[PDB]
Amino acid sequence: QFNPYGDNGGTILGIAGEDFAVLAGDTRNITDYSINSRYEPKVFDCGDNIVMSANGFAADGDALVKRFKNSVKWYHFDHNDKKLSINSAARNIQHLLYGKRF
Amino acid sequence: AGYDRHITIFSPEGRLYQVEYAFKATNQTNINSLAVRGKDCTVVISQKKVPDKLLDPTTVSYIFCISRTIGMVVNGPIPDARNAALRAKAEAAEFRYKYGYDMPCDVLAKRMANLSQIYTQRAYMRPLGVILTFVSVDEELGPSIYKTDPAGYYVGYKATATGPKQQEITTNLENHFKKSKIDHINEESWEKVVEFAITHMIDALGTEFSKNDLEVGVATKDKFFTLSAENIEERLVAIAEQD
Amino acid sequence: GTGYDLSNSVFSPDGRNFQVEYAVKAVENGTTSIGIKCNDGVVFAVEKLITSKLLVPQKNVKIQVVDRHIGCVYSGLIPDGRHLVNRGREEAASFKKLYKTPIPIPAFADRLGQYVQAHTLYNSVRPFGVSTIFGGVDKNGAHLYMLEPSGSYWGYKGAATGKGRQSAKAELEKLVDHHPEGLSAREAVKQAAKIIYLAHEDNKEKDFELEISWCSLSETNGLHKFVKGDLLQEAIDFAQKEING
Amino acid sequence: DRGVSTFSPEGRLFQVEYSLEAIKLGSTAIGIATKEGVVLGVEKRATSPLLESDSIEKIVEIDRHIGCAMSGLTADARSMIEHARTAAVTHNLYYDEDINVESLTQSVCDLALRFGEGASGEERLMSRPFGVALLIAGHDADDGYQLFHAEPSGTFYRYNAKAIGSGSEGAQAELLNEWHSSLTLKEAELLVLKILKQVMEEKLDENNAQLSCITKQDGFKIYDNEKTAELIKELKEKEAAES
Amino acid sequence: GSRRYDSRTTIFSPEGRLYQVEYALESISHAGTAIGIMASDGIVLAAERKVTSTLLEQDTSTEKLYKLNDKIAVAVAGLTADAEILINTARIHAQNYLKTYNEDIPVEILVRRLSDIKQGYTQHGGLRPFGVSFIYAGYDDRYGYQLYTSNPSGNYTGWKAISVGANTSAAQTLLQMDYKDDMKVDDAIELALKTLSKTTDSSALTYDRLEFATIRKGANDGEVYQKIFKPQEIKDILVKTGITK
Amino acid sequence: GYDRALSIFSPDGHIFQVEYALEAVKRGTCAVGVKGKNCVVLGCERRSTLKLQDTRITPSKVSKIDSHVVLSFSGLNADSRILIEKARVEAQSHRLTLEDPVTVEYLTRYVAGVQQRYTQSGGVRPFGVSTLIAGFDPRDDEPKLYQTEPSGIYSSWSAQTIGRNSKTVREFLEKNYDRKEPPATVEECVKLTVRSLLEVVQTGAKNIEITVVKPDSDIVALSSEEINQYVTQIEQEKQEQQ
Amino acid sequence: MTDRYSFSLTTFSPSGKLGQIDYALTAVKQGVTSLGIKATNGVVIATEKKSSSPLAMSETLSKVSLLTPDIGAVYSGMGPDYRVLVDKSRKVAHTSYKRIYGEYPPTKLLVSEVAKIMQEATQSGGVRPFGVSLLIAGHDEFNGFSLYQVDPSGSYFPWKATAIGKGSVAAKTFLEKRWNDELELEDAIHIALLTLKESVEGEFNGDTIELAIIGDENPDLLGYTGIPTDKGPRFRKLTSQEINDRLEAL
Amino acid sequence: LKKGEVSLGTSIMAVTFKDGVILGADSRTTTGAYIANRVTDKLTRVHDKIWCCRSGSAADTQAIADIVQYHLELYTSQYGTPSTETAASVFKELCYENKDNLTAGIIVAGYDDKNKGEVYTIPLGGSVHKLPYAIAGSGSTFIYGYCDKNFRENMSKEETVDFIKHSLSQAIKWDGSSGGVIRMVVLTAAGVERLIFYPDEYEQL
Amino acid sequence: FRNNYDGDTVTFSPTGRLFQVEYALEAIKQGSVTVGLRSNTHAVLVALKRNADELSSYQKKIIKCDEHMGLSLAGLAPDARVLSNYLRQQCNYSSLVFNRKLAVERAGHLLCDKAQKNTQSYGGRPYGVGLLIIGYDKSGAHLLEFQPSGNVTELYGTAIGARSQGAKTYLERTLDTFIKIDGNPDELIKAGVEAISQSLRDESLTVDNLSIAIVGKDTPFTIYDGEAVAKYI
C-alpha cells in the first residue's frame, strides 16, 4: 500500500582531470518548498581516495552510503588493508544497487 | 537385567533402570502427603519441611496450583517437581484455549503419562522421578483424586498416601471407609474434613503437628484455595483440646 | 563411569546425576557472596579476591544488573554465570515489552529456574554451576531469592554461600533474628560488611575488596544501585571496629 | 575410536596430528621464492610404465598468476583446489582486481579446520580435516613474489623457501644455503632439479617430474617436460665434474 | 561418552561386506522358505508356511504372497515386519512409473529401486539393514518371463530356478537336475511338489501348511493371469499330481 | 552420532574404510581395458559355476553411460548402480548447459567427486567399488581410458587391470603391450585382450565378454562364438613351445 | 540433545536375534490374562482389570479401549506403552479412512498400520519398540467377523482364538475344544469367565472383570432412538452389573 | 477475506465507585440489518477479578479475546495474578501487529486491592491508556459532558448502580447501533456480581 | 578416568576444572610471549616475533581489529582466528546499529558466551588460546586478559605465553611508576621491551622483528615494525 519513496533535489558535478579529480556538490537539502538543512552535504569522502555522492532522495542515499562504508571496512580487514580503487568501489556500488532493484 | 543406562534397550524383566529407580527416589525431603475426598469437597494435607531459619517458611511449598480448580502435589526432588509443574501449567491453559473448557484431573494425568513414557523411550531426554497427585472436585466426575506414579502408569483412587509412612496412613483410611461403608467421607463441610484428616495423620506419623509443619490445599466445586497459617491453626486448636 | 557420570539421558539411582552433585561441591570451595533481606529492601555483597597489585580497584565488577532494579551477583564458575545472565536479560526485556511492566521476582525466578532445569535433562549439554543470589523490589515488596546448580530455588530472608559460609551464616542469622527481619536498609549495609569481613578471616592468604550494593523500595526509590562513596566508607568503619582495628 | 573434542595435553586434537603425518608420506614438492621468480618443482611420479604422463595432477592453476603444489593425497587436495579457484574468481568479480597471496590462503585454511557437529558462526560438519598440505605461490602487485605454506590444520606461515615430502630433510637444509635475494630464472630451474636429484634415491627424469614457475613476464607458466629434459641432461655433466 | 555408545557396525568388515549385513543373512536362513520356478508357460511359486495350528487361522496363506501389480507378485523369505516397508514402496514406485511413461514397470527396473533403498538403509543414518529377500515373479513384454532375487546386500541376479530362506542348497540341487524348458504349468507344479517334499521330513504334508501361487498365461488373457491359491485349492492340486505329500 | 569418525587418519596414516574397500575389489570380478590408438577394447570376466542363469537377466558387465561413453567395474553390484545413475545425470546436464556432446574426462570428474565426498565428510559411508570409464571425446581419433577409485583419484591409463589376478594380467601387459607402441590394428587389440583374460578366468570363451568401441558411438560386443575362434588360435600358438 | 544414538538398538548376530524384541516379548507374558474368541457369530473379548493398592479403584481402570466405534482392542504388557501406541493408532484410523474414504477402516488394513508403527520404532535408532501385543477385533460386512494379534515385533497374524498374558498355554488349550465353528454368544461369554476363574481366585468377582462384545449393540446410544439412516456400530462394551449377573449362572 | 461483517453495541464503559469498579454494557450483534443476537455475553472475563467490554467487530473481538484468555491463564499460574495494566498490554500487542484485519475497541477494567479499581482503554490501532474511568465506542462523544460532570469518585453502590443504568439507557436511545439488554458486572474483592436487565426494564427505569 | 572429563564437555568435577581446561592453559605458553602494560591514557603490547622455521619470514601476529581495538595472541593460531573473525563482525554491527564503541569488558562477556555454547556439545570444543586486548575508550585506557576458562580480568599489567613469571614480577614492581605517568608514550614502551627480556632467559631478542603496538588518547592504533622499535631497546 504506502510508497514513502519519492525524490528530493540537490546537484552534483564531477570532473576528471589529468592528475586530479573533483566532486563538487551543494549543501542544501530540501523536500519540496521546505529547507531541511543549509549546511549538510550529500557528498562524503569514503576513503582510499574515493569520494562519493548519492544525490537525490535522502532516505535511499543515507542507507546506500552506510552500506558502502561497512563494505569498505571489511575489504580492508580481509585483504591486507588493500587500497580500494575507484574501479573496485564502482563494481561494489553496482552490486549493492542491483541488490535493491526489487 | 538389561543395561538401560548405556543404551535405551529393554530388560527381560520388563522394567528398566530408569523406571525402577524412579519408583524409589521420590522421598529424601522427608515428606508425607495424603489426600482424602469428602462427600462434596477434596482435602489435601502435606508435610511442610522448613528446615532452617535462613528461609521464609511460606516460600517452601510442595503443593502447586496448576489451574483454578486443579491442584497438583508433586512428591519428588524439587527441580523435577518444577519441571513437571511448568509443563502441567501450560497444558492446562492450552487445553482451555483450544477446547474452550478448563482442564480436568484425568486428562492432565494422561498428557503427562504419555510424556513420561516418551522420555523413557528416548535416548535424548531423561524421565523425572515424580509422583503427581492431582485433585479437584470436578463438575462431572465428582470429587476426584487421580494419582500418577513414574512409569507413565496412573490410576484413580478413593484416597491415597505418599511418603515412607504411606502404610501407616493407609491402615487409618481403610478402617474409616469400611466402618462407614462408603469410599468417601460422610462429612460434607471442608472444615470438618480437614480436621478429621489431621487426626488420622497425627496418629499415623506419631507426632503432633504445627501449622508450620503442615501446608493445606483445599478443593471445592469450581474453586481451589490454599489455607494460610492462621487458617491451619484454627483446625489444630480443636484437636489439641479434645481427648 | 556408569553413564550416570557421562550422560543425563537417564534417571540415577541417587535421583541425580553425579555431575550435577559436583556443581554443588564446586560452589562451596569458591568465593563468598551473601544477600540480606530487610523490611524495605535487599542488600547484596560479595567478596572480590585480590591476588596482585596488577588488578584495578572497581573497574571489575561481579554484581551486574538485569533490568534496572534487580541486582544479580553469583559465586562459582565464571563462564556459566555470563551465560545465565545473558538469558536473564532476554526474559526480562521480553516481559517489559510484552506486559508493559518491570518483572516480579517470583516471576523472574521461574523463568531462569526453568532454564537451569533444562540444561540438566540432556546428555551432552553442560549443567550450570553457579549459585546466584539475586533479588530486588517490585509492587508488593522486596524479595531475596537464591538459585542453585540443580535448578533449585526458594525465597530467603538471609542467604550465605562460599568458602567462609559457616562464619557468614552464623553472624547473619544472629543479626536477622535480633531484628524484625533485618531492620533498616541503611543499618543492613554495615552489617553486611561485617559478614564479608568476618568471612575473610577464613582466607587471609589473600586480600579482599569489599563490594556492596542494594536495592530498596524507599531507600533507593525502587532502583538497584551500587553501594559507594560515603555509604561504602561507613560500612568499612563498622567492620574494622568489631573485627579488631 | 577418537572423539572430535578429545585433545592431547597441548591443546591439539588427535585427528589434526594424524593428518599431518600422511602429508609427509606423499610426494616431494619444493618451492624457492626470490624476487626474480618463484620456481616450483614436484615429483609427478609414474606409478607404472603404462601410466600416461600429465593425467596426474601435482601442478595446479588457482588463477593465471597463481599456482599450488600439493603433498599427501591427491583427491583430498581437490576440495581445497576447488575452494581456492572459487575465492579467486569471486574477488575478481567484486573488486575487479587480483587476490593477494595471503588472502587466498586464509580463505581455504578457515574451512580446513572444521570437523565435528559443532558450529559458532562457522559451519563444521566434516568427519576429518584434509590429509594434505599445499604450497601456494603467487605474485601480487603490492608484495610481489611470495610463497605461503598451507597446513590443513588452519595454520598458515609465510615463507621465502619451503620443501615438504619425505625428501624434506635434504631439501630444506640445501635450500637455506642456496637462498639469495635475486638470481636468474634459468639458473634457478636448473638448481631446483639439482636439489631434487639429491634427495631422490633413483635417477631423476621428466617422466616423474614436472616443473613450473611464476613470472611477472607472463603469469603462471608450467615449465613443460621437453624443455625440462634438456636441463636434466646438462645436470649429468655439471654434477660429474664437481665430483 | 555417548559418542562412543555408537555401535560402528555399518562400516565394512575386511571380508568385503558390512558386519550387520552378513549377520542379517543368517536371520533369513532361519525363517521361511520361498521357492521360485520360472516355466515356459508360467511362473510357479511355493512357500512353506511357518507356523500352522488351529489357534492360527489356517484359511489364510497370503501371509507372505502379495501381488505388487496386475502381473507382478513377490514371494517373501524373512520376517513380516521387515518385508512390509519395501512392499509399500515398490507398490508406489510401480504407480510413479505407470503415471510418468504411460507403461507398466519392467521387472528389473522395479527390482533396482528396491535394492538401492536396501543399500541405503545402511548407507545413510547408520541404521540396520533388512531381514528379507524377495523372489520376484513377473512378465514383461520385452524378455518374456523374468524371475529375480534381491538380498539386503543390494546384489541381484536373475535365475531360471532358485530358492531362498532355509534349505537353499538342497532344493537348488534338485531343481538344476529336473529342469527343462518344455515344461508346462502342470509339469512344474508336480516338480515343485516333489522338491518341497524332499526338504520337509514328515508323515504327511497338508494343504494348509502351504502358500502357493502361479502366474500363467490364462484363458481370459493374452497377458498373464495371476492365480493365488488358498488351502482348499492346494488340496485339489495335491490330488491331481497324485503326490499326497 | 554418525556425522563423525567413520573416516579419520590413523597415526599410521591409513584410513580404515578405504583400506577395506580395496579388498572388495580383489575379491570380485575381473575387468581390463586395452587401448589401440583407433579403438579401445574392454574385456570382462563374469564368473559363475552354477549353470541355471542367463545373461539376459544377469546384469551386463559393460554398461552404457552414453552411446560413446561406456563404464566397467569390479566390486559390489549395489554400490556401482549408485555411481552409474549420477553419470547419466551428468551427461545430459552437460549437454544441456554447454551445448556440446560430452567430453569423457568431465564425467570422470563428477563420479570421482562423489567418491571423495562420502569419505571426507560424515553422514554417509564410502563405496567399495572401482571403475573403468572409457569412451571417445568428440572430434578425436585417440582412445580414452580412465580409472577412478573409492579414494576418488583418477588418471588416464594405456591398459589397466583390476580385480582377480591383477598380477598375472599386469605381467602380460608389461611384456606384450607397450605405452609407446600399442596395437595399431583392431584385430591385434582383440587378440591381446583375449590372451590376457583367458589365463585367469579358467574357462573358455563362454565366461569372457568382449566389447570393442571404435570411434564415436561405434560399439560392437563380439559373442561367445567369435571369441572361440581366437581361443582356438591361441591354443595353436601355445603348442609351438609344447 | 539428539544425534548420539543413531545406530539401531536392535542389531543382528548369526542367530539373527533382535535384542530389544526378545526382552519385550517376555513382558507380554507377565501381563494379565486377556483373551479373544472369535465365535464366528460375533467376537467376544474379556480381560481382568485389577487393583494394585487397597485404595485404588478398578472402575478407573480399563484395559478395553475403543480404537474406532466398531474396532476394539485388548492387550497384555506395559500399561503406558499401550496408551501411547493406542493414541497414534486412533490418529491414523480417523484422519485417513473417515475423511479420505469417508467410512470406518477395514480391520486387516488397520492391522497393517498398527504393525508398521511398531516395526518403525525398532528400525529407527534412538528409540525402542512397544512392549505389548494387541488383539484387534473388528467387524465389517465385507470381511465378516475378524480377529488379529499384532506382536511387539510388528509381525502379525490372525488367530481363531488366542490368549496372552499369564496362563497363556493352558487358557488357549481348554478354549480350543470349547470353541466350535458355530458357537452361541452367551456360551462364549461363559467360557471366557471360566478361563479367568482358573487364573485367579480370592479376588475374582464379576465387578472386577471387564467384557466387551462385537455383535449386539444399542442403537439408542448412536443417535437412532428416532428413525435410523442405518443400524450403525456393532461393538458395545458391557457394564459390571451385566458381567456379575452372568457369573452366577456360570 | 471475510464476507459480510459484524458489529456490536458500541457504548461501553467502566466507572469507578466506592470499593472498586462497576463495568457496564449494552449488547446486540447485528450482521448488516439482520439481528444476529438480542442478547449477548460480550461481558468477558479475562481473569477472575479483571473483566472487559468488547466492541468493534464480533468476529475479530472474540478471536482476540480467546488468545488474551490463554495468555492470562498461563500468566496467573506461573507469574502470579495479573494487573489491569498487564491484561491491557496483551490485548494491545495482538491488535497492533494485526491492525491489518482487526477492529477492536476494548475497555479492560479489573479490581486490585492495592490500586483499587482501574480502567485501561485501548482504542482501534491499539494504544494503552490509563484513565480513572472510561467510556468508549462511537456513541461515547455524545455522553462526554454528562459523564465528566456526574463522574465522582467514591460514590455509594446504589448511586453508581443508578448512574450506570441511566448513563447507558440515555446513550442507547439516541444512538442506533445500540440496543438489546444492559448487563453490568460489579468487581470488588468479595467477588463478581452479575446484573442483567432486559429492554422493557431499562427504558422505563 | 581420563576418558571421563576429556572430550566430555557435559561433565564437572568437584573442583570444576576438567582436563580440557588444563591443556588449554598449557597451549597458551607454547605460543610466543607477549606482555601488557598500561597507564590510564595508553595501553601497550610488546610482543616477540621469532620464526619457527629457518626460511620462514616474519609476519604480523598483532592484528588491528578496529580503530580503537586490537588484540595480540598467545596460543593456538586457528583458535585465535575464528574469535578475531567474530569480533571484527561484532565491531561493525555495534557501529552501524547503536553507534556503540566497545569497551573491553563487554566484548569479553560476549567471548565467554561463544566458548560456552561450544562446551555444551560434543561436536564443538573448548579453545586453547589466551588473548590480550587493548583499547582506549572514554573510561581511559584498558588492557584485558581473556582466558579460554572464561576468566576475564582487566589488569594494569600481565604477560601470557611462555615464561610469564619473568615479566610479572618486574611489571608488579615498575607498576607504581608507570600508572601515574600520563601523556608520555616512550617510557612505557621502553619498559615493555625490558619486561619481555626477563621472560627470555635462553631465547633470542630480535632488534628488527620485535613488534610493539600501542593505543591511546593521543595515539590511534599503530604497530611499530622494523626500524621504529630501535630507540626503545
Those residues with Cβ within 8 angstroms of residue G164's Cβ, 6 or more apart along the chain or in another chain: G28, G29, G31, G34, G35, G75, G76, G133, G135, G149
Straight-line distance from the first to the last Cα atom of chain H, in angstroms, rounded to the nearest whole number:
43
Residue that the C-alpha cell 614436472 belongs to: D210
Cβ neighbours around F185 below 10 Å, total? 12
Contact F45, E132 (CB under 8 A): no
Residue whose C-alpha is closest to residue C128's, from B130, D118, D119, I16 = I16
Residue whose C-alpha is closest to residue H50's, from H202, H162, H191 = H191
The torsion angle over the Cα atoms of residues I158, I159, I160 and I162, rounded to 10 degrees, is: -150
Contact D69, D42 (CB under 8 A): yes
CATH number at residue F93: 3.60.20.10
Cross-chain Cβ contact B54/C120 below 8 Å: no
CATH number at residue H192: 3.60.20.10
How many folded domains does chain E comprise? 1
Give the span between the Cα atoms of G7 and E18, in whole angstroms. Answer: 14
Residue whose C-alpha is closest to residue I31's, from I69, I70, I72, I71 = I72
Chain C residues closer than 8 Å to E1 by CB: 6-7, 123-124
Question: Of C31, C32, C120, C161, which one is the catalytic site residue?
Answer: C31
User: What are residue C216's DSSP bridge partners?
Assistant: C41
Give the span between the Cα atoms of B101 and F127, in whole angstroms. Answer: 58
Give the span between the Cα atoms of F20 and F151, in whole angstroms. Answer: 12
Contact B30, B46 (CB under 8 A): no
Shortest Cα distance, chain G CAs vs residue E30, angstroms = 8
SS3 of chain C = CCCCCCCCCCCCCCCCCHHHHHHHHHHCCCCCEEEEECCCEEEEEEEEEECCCCECCCCCCCCEEECCCEEEEEEECHHHHHHHHHHHHHHHHHHHHHHCCCCCHHHHHHHHHHHHHHCCCCCCCCCCCEEEEEEEEECCEEEEEEECCCCCEEEECEEEECCCHHHHHHHHHHHHHHCCCCCCHHHHHHHHHHHHHHHHHHCCCCEEEEEEEEEECCCCCCCEEEECCHHHHHHHHHHHHHCCC
Give the span between the Cα atoms of B229 and D24, in whole angstroms. Answer: 79
How buried is E46 (Cβ within 10 angstroms: 0-12 exposed, 13-18 middle, 19+ buried)?
A: buried
Q: What share of chain H is helix, strand, coil (3-state, %, to 5)?
A: 35, 35, 30
H42: left (phi over 0), alpha (psi -120 to 50) or beta: alpha
Query: The domain containing residue C223 runs over which residues?
Result: 2-244
Straight-line distance from the first to the last Cα atom of chain D, in angstroms, rounded to the nearest whole number:
53
How many folded domains does chain G comprise? 1
Give the span between the Cα atoms of A29 and A58, in whole angstroms. Answer: 8
Give the span between the Cα atoms of H108 and H91, in whole angstroms. Answer: 9
How buried is E76 (Cβ within 10 angstroms: 0-12 exposed, 13-18 middle, 19+ buried)?
A: buried
- The arrangement of strands across the sheet holding E156-158 comes to E65-67, E72-78, E132-140, E144-150, E156-158
Residue whose C-alpha is closest to residue F32's, from F82, F66, F74 = F74
Q: How far is CA I52 from CA D156, D159, F63, I24, in A?
A: 12, 11, 55, 21
Q: Is the dihedral of CA F59, F62, F64, F65 positive or negative?
A: positive
Cross-chain Cβ contact G57/B158 below 8 Å: yes
Cross-chain Cβ contact H88/C100 below 8 Å: yes
Q: Is residue H1 part of a domain?
A: no
Indicate the residue type of F219: I
DSSP I4: G
Q: Where are the domains of chain I?
A: 3-233
Contact C18, C4 (CB under 8 A): yes
Q: How far is CA I30 from CA F78, I26, I34, I201, in A?
A: 50, 7, 12, 16
Length of chain F in terms of residues written: 242
Contact F49, E41 (CB under 8 A): no
DSSP I173: H
Method: cryo-EM
Cβ neighbours around H98 below 10 Å, total? 14
Straight-line distance from the first to the last Cα atom of chain B, in angstroms, rounded to the nearest whole number:
53
Count Cα atoms within 13 angstroms, Cβ side, for B232.
21
Give the span between the Cα atoms of D37 and D186, in whole angstroms. Answer: 10
SS3 of chain D = CCCCCCECCCCCEHHHHHHHHHHHHCCCEEEEECCCCEEEEECCCCCCCCECCCCCCCEEEEECCEEEEEEECCCHHHHHHHHHHHHHHHHHHHHCCCCCHHHHHHHHHCCCCCCCCCECCCECCECCCCCEEEEEEEEECCCEEEEEEECCCCCEEEECEEEECCCHHHHHHHHHHHCCCCCCHHHHHHHHHHHHHHHCCCCCCCCCCEEEEEECCCEEECCCHHHHHHHHHHHHHHHCCCC
Contact I92, A74 (CB under 8 A): yes
Task: For residue B238, give the 3-state DSSP assignment.
Answer: helix
How buried is E28 (Cβ within 10 angstroms: 0-12 exposed, 13-18 middle, 19+ buried)?
A: buried
Query: The domain containing residue G147 runs over which residues?
Result: 1-249
For domain I3-233, say whether CATH 3.60.20.10 is its number.
yes
Give the span between the Cα atoms of D168 and D190, in whole angstroms. Answer: 19
Residue whose C-alpha is closest to residue E11's, from F178, I232, D1 = D1
CATH number at residue E52: 3.60.20.10
Chain I residues closer than 8 Å to E2 by CB: 122
- D140: its cell numbers: 601480487
Those residues with Cβ within 8 angstroms of residue H202's Cβ, 6 or more apart along the chain or in another chain: H165, H168, H169, H172, H182
Contact C27, C164 (CB under 8 A): no
Contact C231, C238 (CB under 8 A): no
Query: The domain containing residue F122 runs over which residues?
Result: 1-240
The torsion angle over the Cα atoms of residues I25, I27, I29 and I31, rounded to 10 degrees, is: -150
Contact H70, B94 (CB under 8 A): yes
How many folded domains does chain B comprise? 1
How many folded domains does chain H comprise? 1
Residue whose C-alpha is closest to residue B43's, from B85, B71, B62, B66 = B71
Give the span between the Cα atoms of C137 and C141, in whole angstroms. Answer: 6
Query: The domain containing residue H51 runs over which residues?
Result: 7-205
Chain A residues closer than 8 Å to D98 by CB: none
Give the span between the Cα atoms of C204 and C202, in whole angstroms. Answer: 6
Rounded to the nearest angstrom, the gap between the alpha carbon of residue G42 and the centroid of all alpha carbons in its chain is: 15
CATH number at residue G83: 3.60.20.10
Cross-chain Cβ contact E3/I122 below 8 Å: yes
Angle separating helix axes C165-178 and C185-199, nearest 10 degrees: 150
User: What are residue E164's DSSP bridge partners?
Assistant: E34
E16: left (phi over 0), alpha (psi -120 to 50) or beta: left
CATH number at residue C23: 3.60.20.10
Contact I180, I44 (CB under 8 A): no
Give the span between the Cα atoms of B206 and B213, in whole angstroms. Answer: 13
Residue that the C-alpha cell 573485627 belongs to: C243
Those residues with Cβ within 8 angstroms of residue F24's Cβ, 6 or more apart along the chain or in another chain: E12, E16, E17, F75, F76, F128, F129
Contact G11, E130 (CB under 8 A): no
Closest-CA residue of chain D to F11: D18
Q: Is residue H77 part of a domain?
A: yes
Task: For residue A6, give the 3-state DSSP assignment.
Answer: coil
- G27: its cell numbers: 513382558
For the question of residue H188 being annotated catalytic, the response is no
Task: For residue F231, give the 3-state DSSP assignment.
Answer: helix
| Strands annotated E in chain I | 34-38, 42-48, 62-66, 69-75, 129-137, 140-146, 153-154, 157-160, 210-216, 222-225
Residue whose C-alpha is closest to residue F106's, from F97, F117, F94, F98 = F94
CB-nearest partner of E84 from G115, G122, G162: G115
Give the span between the Cα atoms of F192 and F174, in whole angstroms. Answer: 12
CB-nearest partner of D127 from F8, F152, F153: F8
Q: Is the dihedral of CA E211, E216, E219, E221 positive or negative?
A: positive
Three-point CA angle B56, B61, B67, nearest 5°: 135
User: What are residue C226's DSSP bridge partners?
Assistant: C213
Residue that the C-alpha cell 527441580 belongs to: B79
Give the span between the Cα atoms of G107 and G103, in whole angstroms. Answer: 12
Hey, is the C-beta of B34 within 8 angstroms of any chain G C-beta? no
Q: Is residue H2 part of a domain?
A: no
Residues of G in CB contact (< 8 Å) with B are: 1-2, 4-5, 9, 19-20, 22-24, 26-27, 30, 52-57, 59-61, 77-81, 83-84, 87, 121, 126-129, 131
Those residues with Cβ within 8 angstroms of residue C154's Cβ, 6 or more apart along the chain or in another chain: B55, B56, B59, B60, C145, C146
Residue that the C-alpha cell 562412543 belongs to: E4
Give the span between the Cα atoms of G86 and A42, in whole angstroms. Answer: 71
Query: The domain containing residue E210 runs over which residues?
Result: 1-244
Those residues with Cβ within 8 angstroms of residue I191's Cβ, 6 or more apart along the chain or in another chain: I37, I174, I178
Name all domains of chain D by residue range, CATH numbers in brackets: 1-242 (3.60.20.10)
Interface test with E, best of C4, C5, C6 (most E CBs within 10 A): C6
Task: For residue G237, give the 3-state DSSP assignment.
Answer: strand
Contact G143, G83 (CB under 8 A): no
Give the span between the Cα atoms of E135 and E158, in whole angstroms. Answer: 9
Closest-CA residue of chain D to F115: D75
Contact B71, B62 (CB under 8 A): no
Hey, is the C-beta of C122 within 8 angstroms of any chain B C-beta? yes
Q: How far is CA G46 from CA E191, F101, G82, G163, in A?
A: 48, 73, 17, 10
User: What are residue G72's DSSP bridge partners?
Assistant: G66, G137
Hey, is the C-beta of C121 within 8 angstroms of any chain G C-beta? no
- F2: its cell numbers: 554418525
What is the helix (H) or strand (E) element at residue G143, kind and residue range?
none
